[PDB]
Amino acid sequence: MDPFLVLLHSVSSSLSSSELTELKGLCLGRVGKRKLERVQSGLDLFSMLLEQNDLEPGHTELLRELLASLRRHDLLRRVDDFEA
Amino acid sequence: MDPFLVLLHSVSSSLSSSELTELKGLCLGRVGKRKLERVQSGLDLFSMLLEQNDLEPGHTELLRELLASLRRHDLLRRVDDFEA
Amino acid sequence: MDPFLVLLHSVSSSLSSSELTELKGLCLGRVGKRKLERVQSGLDLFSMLLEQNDLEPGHTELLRELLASLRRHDLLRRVDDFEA
């Protein structure tokens, strides 16, 4: 979905290196360590998460949980505005 | 034709590696992963997209919005001035 | 699992630079200097400790011992609430 992809791009654009590292750690349970090593930005991480189908454009509960964990309510608000 | 090609080359010559990979992700839906693996230049990706005639001189709206998503003012205005 | 990881992230977030240095000095005996020279947060320190199997969600005695060594009763009661 093009709107979903552009929303994901916007979400990945607003992060920083420290938040990127924190997210990379927080996804160690699902994503393998070797694949997490090669990532350079959160956009690739989002694509890889889309790969295992645990995150899908129709249902983004994992994305909401991850964003709420990072104490970034603005991005969660953007996500739920997209949903509505 | 040739003006279209020179415009494409000019817009490709003014892109960065981060912009290159962000653009590569942003068009994940229309291009398979295998083809995107071997993409190293913006002109090659533009030609690959043109192969499916999604980007054409008669209809360049997709490229317009794709560049606008990257927040590039000068390139977008040059493209808008290309046909005029 | 996910509750264990989120608890670990939450307890690591409350750490400070001085607390991080104190924890690194205390943990210097557990692991090598090189493995402790690149760690920038207690989050990555716990990630490293998970490799040696000294820290696990089932058995967190070492974690609470280290936390009490820094005299942070809030983290002790937080982990107690998690496990009970």
Binding site: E51, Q52 | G32, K33, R34, K35, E51, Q52, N53 | -
Partner: protein
């Protein structure tokens, strides 16, 4: 039907999609193996199973619509309607395999061939391979069939890719 159009299509095709076309045309040419695209097209023309619609369907499957506009002077709507109202030259199994192979990079086919090294040979697939070549090799040993896709689905599941498994389940539900 003329030789000129066949020659132009051959010389306008990149080396990457020639293998795609050869794999796609395996069903029609089941008794012989052609080395290049021109020989395959000549064999189809000789066999009488070649026409404007067949070429349009092949170019639509290979996703090179610009050549359809330039050479055959047709758009997506016309060829799609013709394919809707006519039998398909290529079965959905082959196009599904092509679409799956279109979604795997160079770092996954190596893992696939390593995983299945016990069932099949080793020294033959030691060279760099494409997913279509691996599918052909598996089909040679009669392990994957249009009605039998358990092994491929399980292998795709084992390499932490679920979306392709969902696509396989979708195709199986379709038929």
């Amino acid at each position: 039907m003329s030789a000129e159009v066949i020659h132009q299509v051959e010389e306008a095709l990149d080396t990457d999609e020639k293998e795609m076309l050869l794999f796609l045309c395996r069903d029609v040419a089941i008794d012989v193996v052609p080395p290049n695209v021109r020989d395959l097209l000549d064999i189809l023309r000789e066999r009488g199973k070649l026409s404007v619609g067949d070429l349009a369907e092949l170019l639509y499957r290979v996703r090179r619509f610009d050549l359809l506009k330039r050479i055959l002077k047709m758009d997506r709507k016309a060829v799609e309607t013709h394919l809707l109202r006519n039998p398909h030259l290529v079965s959905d199994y082959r196009v599904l395999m092509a679409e799956i192979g279109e979604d795997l990079d160079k770092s996954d086919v190596s893992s696939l061939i390593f995983l299945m090294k016990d069932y099949m040979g080793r020294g033959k697939i030691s060279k760099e391979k494409s997913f279509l070549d691996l599918v052909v090799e598996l089909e040679k040993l009669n392990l994957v069939a249009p009605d039998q896709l358990d092994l491929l689905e399980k292998c795709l599941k084992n390499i932490h890719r679920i979306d392709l498994k969902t696509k396989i389940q979708k195709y199986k539900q379709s038929v």
